[PDB]
Structures are given as C-alpha cells and as structure tokens.
Amino acid sequence: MKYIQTEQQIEVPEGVTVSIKSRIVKVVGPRGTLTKNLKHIDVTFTKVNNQLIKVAVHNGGRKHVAALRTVKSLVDNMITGVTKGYKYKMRYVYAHFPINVNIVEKDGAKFIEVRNFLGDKKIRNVPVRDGVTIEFSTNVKDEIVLSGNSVEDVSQNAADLQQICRVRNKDIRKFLDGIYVSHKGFITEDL
Amino acid sequence: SGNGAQGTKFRISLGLPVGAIMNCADNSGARNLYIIAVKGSGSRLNRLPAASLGDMVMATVKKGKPELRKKVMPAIVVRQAKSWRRRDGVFLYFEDNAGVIANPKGEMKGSAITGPVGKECADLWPRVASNSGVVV
Amino acid sequence: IIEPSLKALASKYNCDKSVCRKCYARLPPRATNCRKRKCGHTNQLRPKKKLK
RNA sequence: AGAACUGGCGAUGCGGGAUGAACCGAACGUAGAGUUAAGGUGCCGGAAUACACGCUCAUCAGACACCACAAAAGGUGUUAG
RNA sequence: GCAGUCAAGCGUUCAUAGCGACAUUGCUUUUUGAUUCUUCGAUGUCGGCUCUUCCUAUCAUACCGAAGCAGAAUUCGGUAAGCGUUGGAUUGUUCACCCACUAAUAGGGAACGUGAGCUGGGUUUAGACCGUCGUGAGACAGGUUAGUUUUACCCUACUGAU
Ligand SMILES: [Zn+2]
C-alpha cells in the first residue's frame, strides 16, 4: 500500500564510530574495524546528534519496508560485534567413536580437521575464515570455542563444522553424532 | 566368478560361450557340463555370454549319473583350451575344456581333480586348488 | 552413553522438526506454511515422527 | 450426423485477424486529392518509447473476439474488501 | 492408460508412515471405438532383423527427503533422460509365459519409425486337402500345405573429396 514514511533508529554507544559513504557502513571500535556493502537495499541514512543514527524509507512497498528493519539489525550486529564480540560454543557428541579435532596448517590457511567421526578414515578439513579465532575450551569435555568480530563470519564458519559431520544412510534419531551449537553468546564478560 | 571367490582375476580370453559342452574334470559322477550362463557376465545386444578359466558358470549335466541330470547347478571352469595371455607375456592353452561341479559358495561337489588346472583358477578358488594335483 | 543433556541438544536439529505432507520437506516445528514453492507453500504440516 | 430463422462462402477481390473459402470492416469501371472504417502507433512497420490512475516478479510471467484448450482444489505471495 | 481433490475408515493405540471407500476434477493419444475430412488414372499392408534420434509418466546408476528407518534389507517421495536397460526354450507373431544372467532387465514416439534396406514366417489371388453349411455351383473374420519382393545414373539431404 506504499507506506509514505517508515523509519528505524540505530543507537551507537560510547567508544565506537560509524561512517557511511552513500551506502558503505564502516563501524570502527575497540575490537577492530568492520565494513559492509549495503548497495542492494536502497535506504537513506542520516546522523542526528552524534549518538543516534536514523534510517528512513520513503514510498516503499511491503517487501521494501520489510528490508528496512534488517538494515538496523545488521548495523547493530556490526556494532555489538566490535564492543562485546561474538562467541560461539559447540559440543561434540558421540556414542562410541571419540571425535578428534585438531588445528592444522596447509599453505598458510589454518584448516580445521576432523578425525574418527563414526570410524571414518576420511579426514574432513574446514577452513577458518579471516577474523575468526578458534580455541579449544578448558575444563569442559569436548567443547570448541569460535570467537570473532563479524557475526556472519563466526556463524558461517560455525555452520561449516556443523554441516561437514553429517550422517548418511543411517537413522538420524538413533545415531546422535555431529558438531552442534550449544550456546551463542558474547566474548566480553559480565554481559 | 562373482560371489564365492576372494581376490580379483585378470581378464582371460573368452573361449566358452553359452551352449559349449566341456568335460567334467572331477569324480562327482557327471561326464560333461553344458554351459547355459556365466556369472558376472555383462549385457550386450546379440552378444553371447562367454566364460573363461576360473569363472563360475551355470551348467547342466548331459551325460553321467541320472541323479545329476535335468537340473541347473553351478560349475567352475578349470581348463580353457583357448589361448590366453598372462601378464608375463606367455600365451598358453590346454588340450580340452574342463569344469568342476560346485555350489554357489565355491565348494566342490567332488573330491579329486583329474588332469591339470589353471593357475588363475587355483588362486581364486581355495577348494579347487586343495583338490588339484598339478597346477599348469 | 546417550547423556540426555546432549540428546536434547542434538534433538534440536535432528528430530524436533516438521514434515510437509506434499513435498516431504523438513521444516521448523512451529511453522505453519512450507517454505517450498513447488508445493505452493501449503499448510498441511505434520510433526516429525520419533522412534517409538 | 439431422432441423429452424437470418447473414455469408460457394460465385468475392480489397483493408484487418502474422498465416486461413465463411470472422471484423467494406463489397470492385480508370485516375487524383481529402477523410475514415475494422485494426493499430518500442523495432521489423506507416503511426505518441503519448498522457492518467492502479495491479503483477513468475528457477516454464503475460500479451486481445472467431482461435487454435485448461479444471476441481490450494498459497502467513501481494492487493483491495 | 495416467494424475489430483475431499477423508468416512484400515493401520495394536494414532484419519493423512503407508493406504484409503462413497463422490468429484482433470490429463494423455502408446488401447479400442465413433466419425468419413485427405488418398481408389495405387502414399507397397503384419512381424522380425538392422540403425539413428527424441519424450519422461524413472527400472538401474548420482545426490537428497520421509517412514510404525536399530543394523542389514526394502518401502514412499524429490531433483533428474547424463548413461545403461540382456542371453535363451515356445509361438509368424505384437503380446505373453518360463529358464538364466545382471546395478537394472522402465514405458513409449518418430506416416501403428525403418520393404528402390533386408527377410516373406503371418495375412490376402490362381493348385490342393479336411470339417461344418448348401440340391448345386460354392461359402467359412475355420484348420492345413505350395506359391516371381522390380528400377536410382536425377534433385536434395548425409558421408567423404576437389
Ligand atoms: Zn512443502
């Protein structure tokens, strides 16, 4: 029905800074720098009082209005990722075969290899995306920790681990094997 | 061959198509074997399924004891009489075509083998090499 | 050992889903319409069967 | 396949429906000028890539009577009630 | 012949895993009818052999989804025609039924593909026999046996070659 004016606000905290060049959002904070290309959405940014940013859509349809809210969420995810960080935690579950995962290095890429998954002799390799820091957890049995700034790079690298250890030609309800997300949190403490 | 035999066999030149009559080389009582099929044989238009040394075939007894006739039974070819080449470049052949009656799992119905057997048949069927006296 | 503390964590992505009656697609549990265009985004959804 | 009324084709070209004996327009001496019919005006193709309000995105969109096919049933696709 | 809609019921309980009555909506032109538009100054008629290509309503192989899927084996469904889909006894057979191999022995179109490509076993002249019918000559979508398969050097197409 072509909503004349729909608008969402973006709250920017103390330490970080946001710079936009005609759609190119650059969020720079204590943990680093994040850049995103949003040139496929066609929204309008405006700075109000150096602590709040407003995004406006003029004469947009229902689908185009639905693309307004995802703009604010993507920028907020970029903002919270450079102050609080993003920390994904997984657990290894197996019935008989202990899954062995180690950090390897070929051609300077820091792959993640998986061994002894359901007794398979094949070594599945998972490449670590840039910005994601992989660390093995302490005092918890079979836990891996994925940490980084970009939520869409930590979770996608996380999704690669979850989808590489699939079970085929068996009953999924019985063979409870895989690398599953346990908790999606933040890197910084107290929050 | 197929099921029953462990290990792989190099290709031996085909000399026994469907309808060939080969002598019975063991003391099972049969006199000859009539090949009607070859186990593990491919399918091609107008192409006759042809057997080689060491292959498992379906054969019927045409002469011999009346208890062994008019029924389908597995058989294993031990002599070919058609010249075939081994990996070591030697072309060899026997005088006649010979077979032994066996079960699908590869155990011989008979107890002893008369005449020589091929080397490729001996290492593919343990129950045939144990009953043979001379290998090539 | 199943360790039910990890069974429900594994059951989140394995059995606690939904099945479309037409295209057999695996769907989120509390979804009402299938995400597949080939069945016309139908609403005939069923819970995923669990082992006995 | 067989009747009723009327108009046509057969006996009929012309403009239109890309194309067609029947449909639409209109029926024909030889020429000129002007205006239109039916049908069209992105290019092939002569004529506005005119104006105005909306609807539709289709991983087999749709596009014009006769006419060269599509239904029951469905869709938190979108729009209006 | 093939595919949907509705869901009374079957399914140990549980309609929709799988099915599915009573009804109802369609699709296909590989069946058989109906029609008589084209061809009776002739478009060579069944089947097989041979060979090419196409269709998907998928038998197998590839990747997946679902199950009353533990494993194994199967079942149902999706993307899919890329690549394969046989050797024989009987019958002229199409069709069919058995033997057997195989991952599998899926269904069809191309003037019911293909006779100046073949074959002539079937059908359908003239010879002859039998049965039934007819006074008889003769009749039989009844059985049986014997019975000439012509021509390219033209144009195009295609294969190679100047
Ligand atoms: Zn669906």
Side-chain angles (χ1 to χ4, degrees):
Chain A
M1 61 79 71
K2 284 271 217 203
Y3 294 80
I4 174 164
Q5 173 67 44
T6 179
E7 183 178 1
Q8 303 266 329
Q9 304 168 26
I10 300 189
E11 209 274 316
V12 60
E14 295 280 325
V16 299
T17 184
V18 179
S19 66
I20 299 169
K21 184 62 185 292
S22 74
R23 255 177 295 289
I24 313 295
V25 176
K26 185 183 286 185
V27 177
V28 176
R31 296 188 63 84
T33 300
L34 289 161
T35 60
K36 189 153 291 301
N37 186 283
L38 288 193
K39 307 206 63 158
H40 51 89
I41 294 192
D42 273 342
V43 297
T44 289
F45 300 95
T46 184
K47 159 204 181 175
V48 176
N49 46 18
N50 185 23
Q51 285 71 60
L52 188 153
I53 310 192
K54 292 181 181 180
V55 181
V57 169
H58 314 288
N59 200 239
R62 185 138 182 289
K63 298 291 180 68
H64 181 22
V65 163
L68 171 58
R69 179 66 179 86
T70 186
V71 167
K72 149 190 182 62
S73 289
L74 281 184
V75 177
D76 293 352
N77 273 354
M78 269 207 288
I79 285 176
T80 61
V82 72
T83 77
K84 291 174 70 175
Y86 274 98
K87 181 174 71 68
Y88 276 46
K89 283 188 167 167
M90 293 180 183
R91 312 305 299 310
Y92 294 99
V93 62
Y94 49 87
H96 183 251
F97 287 109
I99 282 155
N100 176 28
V101 173
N102 310 103
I103 296 311
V104 302
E105 182 268 332
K106 64 180 83 174
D107 299 354
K110 186 180 289 293
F111 276 80
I112 292 183
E113 74 175 4
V114 186
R115 291 161 173 310
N116 206 25
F117 176 75
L118 276 164
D120 291 331
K121 297 288 191 179
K122 182 176 89 133
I123 296 92
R124 309 142 201 259
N125 297 285
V126 181
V128 174
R129 293 181 184 271
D130 282 328
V132 188
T133 303
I134 309 281
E135 292 293 324
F136 291 87
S137 166
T138 314
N139 69 55
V140 175
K141 190 206 163 83
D142 306 316
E143 183 179 39
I144 193 66
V145 162
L146 298 90
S147 64
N149 293 326
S150 178
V151 65
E152 42 188 62
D153 291 331
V154 173
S155 55
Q156 181 54 74
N157 193 0
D160 273 335
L161 280 173
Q162 188 274 331
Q163 297 276 282
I164 199 72
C165 300
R166 290 250 289 288
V167 182
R168 319 193 317 121
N169 317 297
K170 296 299 183 292
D171 203 318
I172 301 299
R173 309 165 309 173
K174 186 84 149 72
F175 292 84
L176 301 194
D177 291 331
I179 297 181
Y180 304 97
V181 175
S182 60
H183 186 273
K184 314 168 173 192
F186 311 114
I187 291 172
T188 60
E189 75 291 336
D190 208 4
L191 317 168
Chain B
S1 310
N3 280 358
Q6 78 272 19
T8 72
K9 200 188 68 160
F10 195 69
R11 170 170 175 83
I12 291 154
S13 295
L14 296 182
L16 299 173
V18 162
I21 291 163
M22 65 204 192
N23 311 331
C24 184
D26 56 349
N27 52 4
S28 53
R31 184 176 177 87
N32 49 20
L33 294 173
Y34 175 72
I35 299 183
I36 71 183
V38 184
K39 297 288 285 174
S41 69
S43 76
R44 176 57 163 79
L45 186 79
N46 289 318
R47 178 160 307 161
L48 300 189
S52 69
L53 190 145
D55 287 12
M56 174 167 283
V57 301
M58 302 294 114
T60 76
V61 172
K62 291 293 187 187
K63 293 189 287 185
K65 291 174 71 175
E67 293 83 3
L68 284 163
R69 311 193 44 243
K70 296 169 72 69
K71 65 184 71 175
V72 187
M73 64 184 73
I76 300 174
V77 179
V78 306
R79 298 198 276 274
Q80 169 149 317
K82 160 74 180 74
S83 176
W84 77 96
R85 173 189 191 271
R86 298 178 157 161
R87 293 181 184 271
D88 67 278
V90 163
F91 279 82
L92 73 165
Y93 62 104
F94 289 88
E95 177 162 0
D96 65 329
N97 321 108
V100 285
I101 293 161
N103 72 320
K105 282 164 191 305
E107 289 87 4
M108 293 177 70
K109 181 113 168 173
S111 183
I113 299 178
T114 62
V117 299
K119 180 67 174 66
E120 300 94 330
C121 198
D123 44 48
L124 215 58
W125 305 100
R127 275 69 174 174
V128 168
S130 88
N131 289 322
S132 48
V134 55
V135 192
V136 183
Chain C
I1 309 301
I2 309 166
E3 194 46 54
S5 294
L6 294 203
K7 180 174 191 294
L9 189 143
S11 286
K12 177 168 304 283
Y13 318 90
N14 293 141
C15 69
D16 197 4
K17 310 274 286 188
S18 292
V19 183
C20 193
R21 292 278 175 81
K22 285 165 61 172
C23 67
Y24 298 90
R26 172 195 317 186
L27 290 176
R30 53 189 171 274
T32 68
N33 268 331
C34 178
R35 72 161 56 88
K36 300 285 102 174
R37 184 195 136 178
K38 65 191 293 180
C39 63
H41 295 337
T42 184
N43 51 320
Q44 292 191 69
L45 304 195
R46 73 177 179 81
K48 174 167 185 71
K49 289 278 183 67
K50 193 62 179 70
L51 166 65
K52 274 152 183 315

Coordinates of all heavy atoms in Angstrom, one line a residue, chain C residues 20-25 27 34-36 39 42 45, ligand 1:
Chain C
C20 N 6.5 -31.7 5.7 CA 5.4 -31.3 4.8 C 4.7 -32.5 4.2 O 5.4 -33.5 3.9 CB 6.0 -30.5 3.6 SG 4.7 -29.6 2.6
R21 N 3.4 -32.5 4.2 CA 2.6 -33.7 3.7 C 2.8 -33.9 2.2 O 2.5 -35.0 1.7 CB 1.2 -33.5 4.1 CG 0.9 -33.6 5.5 CD 0.8 -35.1 6.0 NE 0.6 -35.2 7.4 CZ -0.5 -35.0 8.1 NH1 -1.6 -34.8 7.4 NH2 -0.6 -35.2 9.4
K22 N 3.2 -32.9 1.4 CA 3.2 -33.0 0.0 C 4.7 -33.2 -0.6 O 4.9 -34.1 -1.3 CB 2.6 -31.7 -0.6 CG 1.1 -31.7 -0.5 CD 0.5 -30.3 -0.8 CE 0.9 -29.8 -2.2 NZ 0.2 -28.6 -2.6
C23 N 5.6 -32.3 -0.2 CA 6.9 -32.4 -0.8 C 7.9 -33.0 0.2 O 9.1 -33.0 -0.1 CB 7.4 -31.0 -1.2 SG 7.6 -29.8 0.2
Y24 N 7.5 -33.4 1.4 CA 8.3 -34.1 2.4 C 9.4 -33.3 2.9 O 10.4 -33.8 3.5 CB 8.8 -35.4 1.9 CG 7.7 -36.4 1.5 CD1 7.2 -36.5 0.3 CD2 7.2 -37.3 2.5 CE1 6.2 -37.4 -0.1 CE2 6.3 -38.3 2.1 CZ 5.8 -38.3 0.9 OH 4.8 -39.2 0.5
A25 N 9.3 -31.9 2.8 CA 10.4 -31.1 3.3 C 10.5 -31.0 4.8 O 9.5 -31.1 5.5 CB 10.2 -29.6 2.7
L27 N 11.0 -29.1 8.1 CA 10.5 -27.7 8.4 C 10.7 -27.4 9.9 O 10.8 -28.3 10.7 CB 9.1 -27.5 8.0 CG 8.8 -27.5 6.5 CD1 7.3 -27.4 6.2 CD2 9.6 -26.4 5.8
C34 N 4.7 -24.3 4.5 CA 6.0 -24.8 4.0 C 6.7 -23.7 3.2 O 6.1 -22.9 2.5 CB 5.8 -26.0 3.2 SG 7.3 -26.7 2.4
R35 N 8.1 -23.7 3.2 CA 8.9 -22.8 2.5 C 9.2 -23.2 1.1 O 9.8 -22.4 0.4 CB 10.2 -22.6 3.3 CG 11.2 -23.8 3.1 CD 12.6 -23.4 3.5 NE 12.7 -22.8 4.8 CZ 12.9 -23.4 5.9 NH1 13.0 -24.8 5.9 NH2 13.0 -22.8 7.1
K36 N 8.7 -24.3 0.6 CA 8.9 -24.8 -0.7 C 7.8 -24.3 -1.7 O 6.6 -24.5 -1.4 CB 9.0 -26.3 -0.8 CG 10.1 -26.9 0.1 CD 11.5 -26.7 -0.5 CE 12.3 -25.6 0.2 NZ 13.7 -25.5 -0.3
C39 N 5.3 -27.1 -3.7 CA 4.0 -27.5 -3.1 C 3.1 -26.3 -2.9 O 2.0 -26.5 -2.3 CB 4.3 -28.2 -1.7 SG 5.0 -27.2 -0.5
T42 N 2.0 -24.8 1.1 CA 0.8 -25.4 1.7 C 0.9 -25.3 3.2 O 2.0 -25.1 3.8 CB 0.5 -26.8 1.2 OG1 -0.7 -27.3 1.7 CG2 1.7 -27.7 1.6
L45 N 0.9 -29.5 7.4 CA 2.2 -29.9 8.1 C 1.9 -30.9 9.2 O 0.9 -30.9 9.8 CB 2.9 -28.7 8.6 CG 3.2 -27.5 7.6 CD1 4.2 -26.6 8.2 CD2 3.7 -28.1 6.3
Ligands
ZN1 ZN 6.1 -28.3 1.2

